[PDB]
Each structure stands twice: as C-alpha cells, then as structure tokens.
Amino acid sequence: KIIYLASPYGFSQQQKTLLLPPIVRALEALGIEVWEPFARNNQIDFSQADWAYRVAQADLQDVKNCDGIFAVVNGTPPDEGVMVELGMAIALNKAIFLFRDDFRRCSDNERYPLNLMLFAGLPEIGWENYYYTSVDEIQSHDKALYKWLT
Amino acid sequence: KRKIIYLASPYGFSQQQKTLLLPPIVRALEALGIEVWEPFARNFSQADWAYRVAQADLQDVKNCDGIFAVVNGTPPDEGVMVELGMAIALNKAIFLFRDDFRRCSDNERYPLNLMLFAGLPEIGWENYYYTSVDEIQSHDKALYKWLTG
Amino acid sequence: MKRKIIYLASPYGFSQQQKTLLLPPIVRALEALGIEVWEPFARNNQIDFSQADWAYRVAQADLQDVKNCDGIFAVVNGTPPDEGVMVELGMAIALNKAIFLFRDDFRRCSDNERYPLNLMLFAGLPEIGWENYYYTSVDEIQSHDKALYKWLTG
Amino acid sequence: MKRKIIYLASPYGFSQQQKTLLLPPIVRALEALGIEVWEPFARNNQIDFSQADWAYRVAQADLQDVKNCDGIFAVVNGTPPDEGVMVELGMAIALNKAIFLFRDDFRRCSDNERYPLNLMLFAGLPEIGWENYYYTSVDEIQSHDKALYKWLTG
Ligand SMILES: *[C@H]1O[C@H](CO)[C@@H](O)[C@H]1O
Ligand SMILES: *[C@H]1O[C@H](CO)[C@@H](O)[C@H]1O
Ligand SMILES: *[C@H]1O[C@H](CO)[C@@H](O)[C@H]1O
Ligand SMILES: *[C@H]1O[C@H](CO)[C@@H](O)[C@H]1O
Ligand SMILES: [Zn+2]
Ligand SMILES: [Zn+2]
Ligand SMILES: [Zn+2]
Ligand SMILES: [Zn+2]
C-alpha cells in the first residue's frame, strides 16, 4: 500500500531534517510504502527554472499512482501545493488522510477545523477518524489508516 | 451551448470584495459568451450545511468545462487550490488569474508554487495566466482561443 | 486647525483591482469623519514589484508615516493578516498611536477563543471593550458609537 | 561578550511536533552564545487554543517581554511570516531594539527584488549589510562575523 506524503516540510532545512523522518517512520511502521516527494523527486532548493516543470509532473504522477494521500495540513493557511495535491487525490478517488497538529484554526465554517473543501473526499459522519492531530496518533488501531490496511 | 467556467476565488469571504471585485470578473467572462458558475453566488442553520456545500461545489467542478482560478494572495487560497487540483486531475481546462504583484514561489520559472501550473503546458503557460481584468478579453490569450479554436 | 491623521495600512495596493476598487471607498468613509488619510501605496508610490534600488526608500517612507500619524486604521483581512500591515501595526502599538482594526472577512485565523485573530493584534487595545475598535464593515466606520468617532470627537 | 536578552519570536509553539523538535535547537544555539533566551510559548505558557480569560494576559506578557528585551530573534519562516511575530517585530523596530531575522525556508514571499520577504521586515535594518542580521540556517547562528555575535560585544 502506497501513501503519498504531501507536506510543506521540505521547504525549511530544519523541518526537512527533523519533522519528516518521524512521520515517514510512523507510516512505514504500519506497513505502508511511503512516497515523500521532496526526497523522491529531489526538490532540495529554490528550483531552477529548467527543472521546475519536471518536478511538477513527477509529483503529479506520484499522486496519480499512489493509493492514498497523507496530507500535512499545518499552517495558516495549509500549503497551496499540498492543497493542489489534495484536490487531485480527491478527484481521483484516492484514500484521504489529513494531519494537523497546529492548534490554530483557519476555517470558513464552524463544523470543520479547516476550509470545508479539504474534507470533500471524507465521509459526512466519521471524518474525524481520518484526521490525525499528533505524530503518535498515526499508530492508533482505532484510526482510519490502520483499518484501511486491515 | 455556452462553455461553463467555474470561477474559484476567495473574494466571497470579504463583504466588500464579494460586492465589488467579483461582478467585474463575471462580466468580463460573460462578455466572452461563457456560462459562469460562481460558487458564492450559487451558495444554512443545519448541522450538515458545510458538508452539503463541499459536495455541491465538488459537483460543480466535476461538471464545469474549465476553471478560472483567482490565485491572488500570499499564499493562494486553500479552497481554490483544492478546486484547482480537482480540475487538473479531471482534465478540465485551466486558467489562472493573478493581479497581485507579490511573488509567493518555490522556484524561478513560475511566480507561484510550481504545482499550480502542473495542468498547463511546459511552454506557453503564460498564455493561460491573466494578470488583469482588462486582459480577460484578449483574443491572444488561451481563454478566447479555447472558446473558439 | 490641523486634521487628525490616519495611516491606512492594507494589502489592497498589491492587487490592481483591489487597489482601484476597495481602497477609495474606505478612504472616503474615513475622510467623511474629517480625517486626513495617509494611504501608503499612493503616498510613497509602491505601484509594482519594487526595484531593488527603491525598496529601502519605500520602507523608510512607510515607517516615517507610521511615526508621524495620529492613528493607524489597519486592514487585517486575509488568512493570515498581511505581514507588512502587522509590522506597521506593531510599530503603532509601541509608539502609542491610536489603534483601529478593520476585518470584513468572516473566516477565522486565530490562536485563541477570546479574539477572532492572533492575540497580539489586540495587545494595544483595552481588555474590555476592544470590540469598539474592531470594525467589520465599511458601513460601520461611520458609527457615532464606535471608537474611531469617539476618538475624533473626544 | 555580554549576556543580552533575546526575545525569540516564532510560530513554532503552535505545532506539537515543532514546539518539541524545532524550538529547542534554536534556543540551544542562542544559549551557546551566552544569550538569555526569552521564549514566549514556554515562558508565558501558551500551550493550546488559549482560554478566553487568559488570552489578554498572554498578549500583555509577550508585549512586556518585547518591551524589556535587548533584541528580537524573529523566526520568519512561512508564506507569509507569522502575523504575531510580525506584530512583535514591529514593536521591536519602534522600541529601538536590536533586530535579527532568520529563515531557513527557501521559498520567496516578497513584494520587491531586493529582499526575500516583504520589505517592511527589513526596515529596522541598515540599507547596506542587512544580510548580516539574516540567518538562513542554524549552523549560522554560531558565526562570529554575523550580527548577533558582533552585537554581543559591541
Ligand atoms: C508536491 O509538490 C510540491 C512541490 O514538490 C511539494 O510540496 C509536494 O507536496
Ligand atoms: C471552493 O473554494 C471556495 C472558496 O475557497 C469554497 O467554497 C470551496 O468550496
Ligand atoms: C506597509 O503597508 C503595506 C502593507 O503590506 C506595505 O506596502 C507597506 O508599504
Ligand atoms: C507573540 O508570538 C506568537 C507568535 O504568533 C504570538 O502568539 C504571540 O505569543
Ligand atoms: Zn483558511
Ligand atoms: Zn507560496
Ligand atoms: Zn493566524
Ligand atoms: Zn508576503
């Protein structure tokens, strides 16, 4: 099972080094094969003008070929690149999992923590089971990633 | 039969912006003969109202012929980005609008995050990229060419 | 009899349409109170991506305007509010200028439940009655019951 | 070298994983220089979506810390930089405080070709040599020929 790991964390040197590996490892510990686009497609700096299109199509192909997206949606607002990747995944009926350990709210509605469009690929009732608020919660057996694999 | 454009924007969140910014954009698009689906105009005390709105706009994106995405702001609005991502995966026509002179980018080719342009051609993507309301009418940009050619 | 000076901090000058359509109605609503409005994009001529030769002078001119104003009227629309406006608002707090905030955007971008935005934005406002300094529509600017009018006539 | 007080403004206390993993190495880097670090999340206890009757005290405590510090070390990562950091940075500029910026985020969020961010962030810096106060990595906080080090002496 393949999870595309969409995040803004590859943009900060400290975040790329410290925040992503514990997330990657939590997902692998479930049995998941993890596609992390920043390393997988080598976007390590302000992309040169002649490599940007290639980087874009590579990330696009991974979203089309994965089985689920694990979208890190921290920030005010969530990262625009993550959001494009999230909309692709929804449109392609891929499995959808959201991660937000940022306690700030950035929402246009009183029902969801974020803009209601991010949850358009999640059920009306138990969308909370797909919404992870802590790295240590990724392992949880009562949450939709585990049940997705079992 | 008019081509259908879904007009994604954050302009419905501000009272003044909804009233003053969106009508001129709609008019410019309609002057091209387009049928405009503007989600704020298309749209309350219920519990499931947010879910129903998400499903309603999702249906509209699925059924449009193209998206015209207002990508002003730093960064572009996350709801527009989700809708733009849907439109790219569903092979809809893609047009971007930004009259904001600020750059919010991860690369030197594009003035925005490169994934916003992933559904556009490698060369000539500028022809789909509108930088002023006055430019929407241009017979030399992709919207007119797509309506005719 | 010198008019009171309001510095109108906003991100609206970055967008051609916003600059042309959103700012003049706000300027008028303030001028209708007898206020002299300092709108930095027009005053200090930041009309496109500033050339390198010029960005320092734009910064110092806006900075000096904040120093010389009597109050700041901060457009704090957006998720999150604009970083330039926020710098100009922090300056105005520190310099004991009058503070008024404008947000007609109904989205919330906050780190707390007491205030609709980041808590620091209200650090220069009283603990009780801060809502009086927080405007949520251009039409509300005129309110003889809100803080801007009371500051002018007080 | 003198034991100056640095206010470490950042958005990193908002995320559980960032508060735990990203702040301590930055605090330790500043403390390796002999600086007294005032980190507002720990020091004024903002740990979650703040309770309404506590929010005003948090704002006033962070404001007082900015008033009583010697300089600000502003984490200005993100698109755009955090509005709370930006308010606290505007205060520091107007309060005559030493100004140090850092960003290891390689994205651009700018209104000008001279600076990688909104030009107002760099207003309290000099026209020539602002790069001195701009740290793009954590190994660079150490460096004796940047701004922090030199300020700690003269
Ligand atoms: C998908 O595209 C973006 C550019 O690499 C990146 O953020 C990834 O999430
Ligand atoms: C699609 O974008 C709109 C504004 O962000 C929102 O309604 C979403 O449905
Ligand atoms: C201060 O106000 C504006 C908001 O970004 C900015 O241009 C500066 O000129
Ligand atoms: C000052 O810094 C923090 C970052 O936003 C803000 O919440 C306030 O504590
Ligand atoms: Zn939002
Ligand atoms: Zn960006
Ligand atoms: Zn915020
Ligand atoms: Zn910016």
Author numbering:
A (entry chain D): 4 to 153
B (entry chain A): 2 to 44, 49 to 154
C (entry chain B), D (entry chain C): 1 to 154
Q: Can I see the authors' text?
A:
Here, we characterize the structure and function of a thermophilic dNDT, the protein from Chroococcidiopsis thermalis (CtNDT). Nucleoside 2′-deoxyribosyltransferase (dNDT) enzymes catalyze transglycosylation via a covalent 2′-deoxyribosylated enzyme intermediate with retention of configuration, having applications in the biocatalytic synthesis of 2′-deoxynucleoside analogues in a single step. The reaction catalyzed by dNDT proceeds via a ping-pong mechanism, with the formation of a 2′-deoxyribosyl-enzyme intermediate covalently linked to an active-site glutamate.13 Transglycosylation occurs in a stereospecific manner, preserving the anomeric carbon in the β configuration in the newly formed 2′-deoxyribonucleoside.
Although dNDT enzymes are selective for 2′-deoxyribonucleosides, molecular detail underlying this preference is lacking. We therefore determined the structure of a ribosylated enzyme intermediate by cocrystallization of wild-type CtNDT in the presence of Ado. D62 is in very close proximity (2.6 Å) from 2′-OH and to 3′-OH (3.2 Å), and the proximity to 2′-OH (absent in 2′-deoxyribonucleosides) can lead to less optimal positioning of this intermediate for nucleophilic attack by the incoming nucleobase 2. An important observation is the positioning of Y7, likely polarizing the –COO– side chain of E88. Y7 does not directly interact with ligands, nor is it at a close enough distance to clash with a potential 2′-OH in the ribonucleoside ligand. One possibility is that Y7 restricts the movement of catalytic E88, but this optimal positioning for 2′-deoxyribonucleosides results in clashes between D62 and the 2′-OH of ribonucleoside substrates, leading to a reduced catalytic efficiency with these substrates. However, an over 100-fold difference in kcat between 2′-dGuo and Guo (6.9 ± 0.7 s–1 at 45 °C for 2′-dGuo and 0.06 ± 0.01 s–1 at 65 °C for Guo) indicates that nucleobase transfer is unfavorable with ribonucleoside substrates.
